[PDB]
Design an enzyme around this catalytic site. Structure first.
Site, short mmCIF file in Angstrom:
data_model
loop_
_atom_site.label_atom_id
_atom_site.label_comp_id
_atom_site.label_asym_id
_atom_site.label_seq_id
_atom_site.Cartn_x
_atom_site.Cartn_y
_atom_site.Cartn_z
N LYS A 158 0.63 89.89 46.14
CA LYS A 158 0.99 90.02 47.59
C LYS A 158 2.64 90.44 47.66
CE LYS A 158 -1.80 86.50 49.52
NZ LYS A 158 -1.59 85.39 50.83
N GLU A 208 8.65 78.07 53.96
CA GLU A 208 8.46 78.65 52.59
C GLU A 208 8.91 77.43 51.53
OE1 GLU A 208 6.77 81.08 51.87
OE2 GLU A 208 7.47 81.12 49.81
N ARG A 209 8.06 77.51 50.34
CA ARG A 209 8.46 76.37 49.63
C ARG A 209 9.81 76.82 48.88
NH1 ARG A 209 3.72 77.86 49.11
NH2 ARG A 209 1.87 76.64 49.45
#
Ligand code: ATP
Ligand code: ADP
Ligand code: MG
Ligand code: MG
Lengths: 70, 466, 518, 50, 49, 466
Positions: free
Chosen positions: F157, F183-184
């Site tokens: 991705k 988002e981490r």
């Protein structure tokens, strides 16, 4: 007058001292509604509360502070 | 310490008190009644200006909106002592059998105590003997351990709980504290009393050595909720005395359901599928007092009714985390006329470790499970093939597995009424040898049907002699 | 030198203490619910103060509570202790200090409350700094990519699900499946790997936490581990703040570090024993505070809660100290329903999963790991080059077996190549079985998997693979220590199968196979 | 080692017990000394800053 | 033996605790009115153990 | 302005303002705290006499009721312009990377705008030449249309996103914006900056040509909700400049669930799964500013997480209502090392019809899908039995399917570090001609494994026919 207050003293307060402390609390309103209490378990101290703020200079406070050494 | 009842909606009562003497959070309101008796609510929420919301503990169909109420100052107080031995009580610690009231000299203690601190906890996992062999060498007890039974609607949970009380009154003294949480009147009453009075040892009935506290689905939710705590106090007294007490709870599922009903009536926000938000903490306070301190230890078993097979149901789901050993009763075994009807598989125990129950005990338990596990794998083989095409060596495995499954059944001293012959108490370390012999193959020639209900392997040998 | 004490005293009392009458803020309780007080409208209270409730008649102790909801004319505060004692009208004084916990070297090998009070009964904690709970995450530039591995000591994890310093790996499972077993093995494996372990024990039993502490004591694992504990009996507030206190301790280890075995250790490992029970405690706290219930009755911010908890686990770069903090949350799924609310939240916010299934556990296989669905998204970066090179073949062969796993009861009656693949897969799966409290060091796992991947165990019958592994390891420990030392020394080499280590290992395994019989 | 740690903790627990006993004795004695001393000037301490 | 030693230490050090109690009693209120029975007298009356 | 904070309940706060100058909805009231560290909020309701309920968008732990609250008079304002290129922002627009503050001279625009009016919409749909052959052929983008990337975690991705950024930077001038919703802080805050700084399609680094905004996981629900709108506001400047912009959103399902949590916190009634009642409207405020206007266009490629695997769930359902293409990346195409790991049989696109992409493009796309479908069906024939059972014209179909599957592979200008092959940008028409030639002719005499990593059919022919 507008604000309510409470007071606690180890010994039974004499009338002259009661008036003296009453007029002492003139920072806010003078002779505010003060409900003098004894709480004899208290020792040589004075806990005065005005509004939602308290003052606790009683000897129990210092005794507890020293006891924190435990 | 005198208030006035404001509202009464169902079993939830709102009382008002002077502001200087509002009852604490878990005090008994003790409403007096005209006849002379009294209704003893308990506070649960201090709200507003000296207003408390309380649960009934009783009917609440005979009281107005102005009755005087006397705060007790202490929580619900229950008798504790040797005087409360061999007596039947309700949630309020009032003798509900025909005998007279407990005297005023008997020490009374609050039901809301605190569990033992972390330091007092014991790590020695001593095994506690029961006499039901399939429980002893599948999933043994643990002193200060929370065993539990699962499955329901026909499988013998109450009967094995009665059998345990009887056998453990045979063993040592086994002063047992039966905590009937929402027990059916027929089940709990006139069957536990009847069976325990019938079960006699040394001309002193087992009923006279055990204390029974029965809540009642008929009683309101609060009584069924706090009955477990009452029984915990009764047992905690003997634990403090140093004796090894054994506390039995009937259908902790009903404990959870009573908690849910109390929460719903109290207006608490519902949680999960309409269950109480405090589901975990109620089980925590009930279960954490059951442990093994240095001085004494409240070993226990807690029956559980799983709805259908849903082990995800909130009551069994909550109670699983607190169990040291689990026993799974299945209807399929019950259809096989097995008193224990316990499933040898899916019934674990945390002390099933080589160095807690003896070196041979672990390996013989696993071997029996291995043998039984094999029998399931080839069940269809035996079904359609009638043991044909088996490896022969597997046929012996099959034969030994069927002999094992029949040999787990034990005549229960409490099951003599239904059909059984007199009960037999099979001591552990006297019948782990029996199972070792069976695995070795000493019973490889005895017919299958002779292992039906005998106890020891010497017993089935003697039966085979005839 | 008593003169030093005389000089230090006699000056602070005279002109070092203010002793000034000034009015400090307090309030009065107006309603006590299920462990929730309103404290009237005590003003000047920070959004998460810890109120004090000074002792009154009939109570010589002080009980603390957290002021969570700050309403107009009402501060609904959840009580940390027992609410049996607090009554309506009780005066409550608010400290100005947010929740803090003692941290550092001294708090090591001790069981403590979330508040840091000892519950081990071995004396008070020795400390000089307290780290505030509920800290903001390290940030964006503060972290570094996870590279250093965390050898858990069990083959399946260390080979197929890498855990690296800074990674947040979830132990997701159901009922009892070895989640605490996997965590306790991971903790036990750090005896000489420069790590400080934190166990949180949320919502557990006092007996269970005592048993775990006894287990760590028995294996000499209390010279490098901290245990926090908020058992089931404890109020929901204590369970709610337990993991945050644990990770505050872990953060202190990460930033400053402690002197462990005569060297500074800035790497930490924290095991939230049950984020499921933590979420349950938080749900109880929220619902008793009348906050709006979300899906499944959990409040709207449980995701934010576990997110701020877990995101404090990081791998700081060299500029900020180079420390680390690995989070190992644990979740109790019901009926293996991974799609539930908290399981979905935690798998979404965590870096990898370790799926433990009841079927495999009851299948006789002790470590019930599910390689198919469990994933470590860090990948091979959290493996030594040796294990990384060795374990690719293991992963491929296990995947092949899982593809054809339906033929275990038909393995013989198939193609020769398929029979070989199934046999190898069965041998590997039997090899990944491991008893409890028996961690395998990295070099040992590398040697075992080098043997297994290459055609060495084919002669060995499947049921005896575990015994083969056990006695082969004993042989290497006693017969060939130099091989283990050599493997360990060059574990980081880019091309681990070097000629020297290759030939030494081949000679050792051949000698063992010759000596032993199967 | 476990025995040695027990002795250290036992002495520490004894130390805590002794400290508590000394505190109680001081409180009892402090009450007696204060009563014979009198508390006339306590009011003055309440207005050093208020 | 630890219990016996502690009781011996507590009994032996009782005077020292009294000496420390006097210092604490003197510093109990940061002052002592001369018109009093005496801090030492109260400590003796409250010597107890 | 100058209100006072009245209530604090977790993230939600209520501030009391005078009767006049009450903040509007989405007016971004700021709370001075610490040392200039402002707890920017976002007003969501107006209540009573000046009381306005706002979302925290920050810690909201050090706050106390009664603090000063400053109203900004407009929604959250974020910097916009080239000054945002190569920078990393949070929801509030403050740069979280190492570099310093943006500065007052840079333009600031409201986060909450309105989508382009009806007239500004492009009447016809124009294909967007992403360059990647499989996407440009099988699931072509739409100029100003959304796209989904349902791929495995770690199947390529990020590499695909880097390649699209490289193409939009190289062929057409363009830029890109990355909106890491929820988002981490490891896989996003760091695992991206290094990848986009090391990755250099040209002299400029992908990082230097993309505006990064991260709504990190640890931030409260308000931040994760509005980070997407911040990204859109930052991209809308470049769209208004007449450029074409790619807006990458990471796991829009996180935007949906952040909205759900915000709605639950505000107390709104839940809707149909527990999702916010305003799910459609919230997904409409976002994702409707992603359109191709006359001046410029914002194309988007939004990763999506399916709850469980329910394409019928309300979150993915509402997302699909706003999707113009779908790419299903697959690890199965990754063991066989093809760089675009796109499954041509699962990836779809609305614009793939004769009218818009022309007749020849649709014909070749349908033919490729047909042969791949035949090859998928013949999986069982080839595996169960073997190649010999394959009939005439069906051996050829599988033979061509291999070459088609390999020919989809392309060497990316950002993949010259992973593999070293030079980058290649195949225009859509070249892809159409290449695949048409492969199907109706040449490419059979050339053995497979030679279409590996090639551009046009001419490229493979000339290069690997020597
Ligand atoms: N790796 C292992 N090897 C051997 N036995 C094991 C192993 N893991 C678990 N067991 C057995 O299973 C029992 C339960 O395991 P454990 O308590 O670790 O699981 P859990 O998932 O953490 O359970 P819980 O949810 O009840 O806390 C252990 O007491 C031990 O009997
Ligand atoms: N040991 C046993 N011997 C014979 N019958 C039994 C035994 N245990 C249970 N039963 C059968 O089960 C019935 C009661 O089961 P019980 O123990 O009440 O299970 P539960 O408490 O789950 O309802 C009895 O009427 C009897 O028919
Ligand atoms: Mg029953
Ligand atoms: Mg566990």
């Amino acid at each position: 007058r507008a604000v309510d207050a409470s007071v606690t003293s180890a010994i039974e307060l004499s009338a002259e001292q009661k008036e003296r402390i009453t007029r002492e609390l003139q920072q806010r309103y003078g002779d505010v509604h003060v409900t003098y209490h004894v709480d004899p378990t208290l020792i040589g101290g004075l806990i005065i509360r005005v509004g939602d703020q308290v003052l606790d200079n009683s000897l129990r406070a210092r005794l507890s502070a020293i006891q924190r050494v435990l | 310490a005198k208030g006035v009842i404001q509202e009464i909606i169902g079993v939830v009562i709102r009382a008002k008190f002077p502001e200087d003497e509002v009852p604490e959070i878990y005090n008994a309101i003790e409403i007096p009644l005209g006849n002379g008796d009294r209704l003893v609510c308990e506070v649960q929420q201090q709200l507003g200006n000296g207003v408390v919301k309380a649960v009934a503990m009783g009917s609440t169909d005979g009281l107005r909106r102005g009755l005087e109420v006397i705060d007790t100052g202490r929580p619900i107080a229950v008798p504790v002592g040797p005087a409360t031995l061999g007596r039947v009580f309700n949630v309020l610690g009032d003798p509900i059998d025909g005998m007279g009231p407990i005297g005023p000299e008997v020490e009374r203690r609050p039901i809301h105590r605190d569990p033992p601190s972390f330091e007092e906890q014991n790590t020695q996992a001593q095994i506690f003997e029961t006499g039901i062999k399939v429980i002893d060498l599948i999933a043994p007890f643990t002193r200060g351990g929370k065993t539990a039974i699962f499955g329901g609607a026909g499988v013998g949970k109450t009967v094995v709980i009665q059998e345990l009380i009887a056998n453990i009154a045979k063993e040592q003294s086994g002063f047992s504290v039966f905590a009937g949480v929402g027990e059916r009147s027929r089940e709990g009453n006139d069957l536990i009393h009847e069976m325990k009075e019938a079960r006699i040892d040394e001309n002193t009935t087992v009923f006279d050595k055990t204390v029974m506290v029965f809540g009642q689905m008929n009683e309101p939710p609060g009584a069924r909720l706090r009955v477990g705590l009452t029984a915990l106090t009764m047992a905690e007294y003997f634990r403090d005395e140093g004796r090894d007490i054994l506390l039995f709870i009937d259908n902790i599922f009903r404990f959870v359901q009573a908690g849910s009903e109390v929460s719903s009536l109290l207006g608490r926000m519902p949680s999960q599928v309409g269950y109480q938000p405090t589901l975990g903490t109620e089980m925590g306070e009930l279960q954490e007092r059951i442990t093994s301190t240095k001085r004494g230890s409240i070993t226990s078993m807690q029956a559980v009714y799983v709805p259908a097979d849903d082990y995800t149901d909130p009551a069994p789901a909550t109670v699983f985390s607190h169990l040291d050993a689990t026993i799974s009763l299945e209807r399929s075994i019950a259809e096989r006329a097995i008193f224990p009807a316990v499933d040898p598989l899916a019934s674990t125990s945390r002390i099933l470790d080589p160095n807690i129950v003896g070196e041979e005990h672990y390996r013989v338990a696993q071997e029996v499970k291995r043998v039984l596990q094999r029998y399931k794998d080839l069940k269809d083989i035996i079904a359609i093939l009638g043991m044909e095409e088996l490896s022969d060596e597997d046929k012996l495995t099959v034969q030994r597995a069927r002999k094992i499954e029949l040999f787990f059944s034990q005549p229960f001293t409490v099951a003599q009424q239904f059909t059984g012959r007199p009960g037999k108490y099979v001591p552990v370390k006297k019948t782990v040898e029996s199972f070792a012999r069976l695995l070795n193959g000493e019973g490889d020639h005895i017919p299958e049907s002779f292992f039906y209900m005998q106890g020891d392997f010497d017993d089935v040998l003697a039966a085979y002699e005839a | 030198i008593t003169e030093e004490l005389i000089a230090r005293l006699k000056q602070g009392i005279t002109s070092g203490v203010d002793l000034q009458p000034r009015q400090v803020n307090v309030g009065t309780v107006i309603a006590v619910g299920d462990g929730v007080a309103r404290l009237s409208g005590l003003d000047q209270v920070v959004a998460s103060e810890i109120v004090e409730f000074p002792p009154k008649a009939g109570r010589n102790e002080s009980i603390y509570g957290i002021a969570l909801n700050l309403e107009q004319d009402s501060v609904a505060a959840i009580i940390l202790g027992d609410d049996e004692t607090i009554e309506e009208g009780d005066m409550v004084t608010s400290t100005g200090r947010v929740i803090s916990v003692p941290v550092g070297q001294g708090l090591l090998g001790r069981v403590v409350n979330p508040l840091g009070q000892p519950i081990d009964g071995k004396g008070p904690i020795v400390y000089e700094k307290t780290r505030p709970i509920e800290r903001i995450a390290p940030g964006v530039i503060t972290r570094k990519s996870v590279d250093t591995p965390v050898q858990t000591g069990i083959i399946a994890i260390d080979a197929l699900i890498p855990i690296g310093r800074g990674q947040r790996e979830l132990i997701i499972g159901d009922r009892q499946t070895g989640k605490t077993a996997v965590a306790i093995d991971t903790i036990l494996n750090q005896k000489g790997q420069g790590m400080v372990c934190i166990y949180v024990a949320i919502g557990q039993r006092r007996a269970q936490v005592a048993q775990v502490v006894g287990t760590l004591e028995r294996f000499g694992a209390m010279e490098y581990t901290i245990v926090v504990s908020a058992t089931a009996s404890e109020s929901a507030a204590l369970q709610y703040i337990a993991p945050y206190a644990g990770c505050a301790m872990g953060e202190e280890i990460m930033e400053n570090g402690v002197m462990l075995n005569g060297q500074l250790v800035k790497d930490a490992l924290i095991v939230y024993d049950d984020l499921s029970k933590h979420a349950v405690a938080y749900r109880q706290v929220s619902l008793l505070l009348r906050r709006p219930p979300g899906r499944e009755a959990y409040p709207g911010d449980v995701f934010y809660l576990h997110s701020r908890l877990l995101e404090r686990a990081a791998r700081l770069n060299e500029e900020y100290g180079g420390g680390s903090l690995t989070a190992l949350p644990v979740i109790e799924t019901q009926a293996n329903d991974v799609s539930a609310y908290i399981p979905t939240n935690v798998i979404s916010i965590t870096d990898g999963q370790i799926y433990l299934e009841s079927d495999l556990f009851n299948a006789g296989q002790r470590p019930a790991l599910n390689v198919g669905i469990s994933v470590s998204r860090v990948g091979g970066a959290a493996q030594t080059r040796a294990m990384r090179a060795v374990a690719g073949k293991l992963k491929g062969e296990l995947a092949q077996f899982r593809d054809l796993a339906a033929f275990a009861q038909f393995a013989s009656d198939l193609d020769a190549t398929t029979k070989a693949q199934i046999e190898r897969g069965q041998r590997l799966q039997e090899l990944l079985k491991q008893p409890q409290y028996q961690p395998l060091p990295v070099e040992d796992q590398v040697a075992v998997l080098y043997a297994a991947t290459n055609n060495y165990l084919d002669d060995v019958p499947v049921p005896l693979i575990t015994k083969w592994r056990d006695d082969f390891l004993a042989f290497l420990r006693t017969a060939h220590p130099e091989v283990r030392k050599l493997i360990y020394d060059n574990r980081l080499d880019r091309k681990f199968p070097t000629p020297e280590v290759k030939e030494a290992l081949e000679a050792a395994i051949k000698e063992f196979k010759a000596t032993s019989n199967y | 080692a476990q025995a040695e740690q027990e002795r250290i903790r036992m002495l520490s627990e004894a130390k805590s017990q002794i400290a508590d006993l000394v505190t109680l004795t001081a409180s009892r004695v402090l009450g007696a000394e204060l009563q014979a001393r009198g508390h006339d000037a306590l009011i003055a301490e309440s207005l050093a800053a208020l």
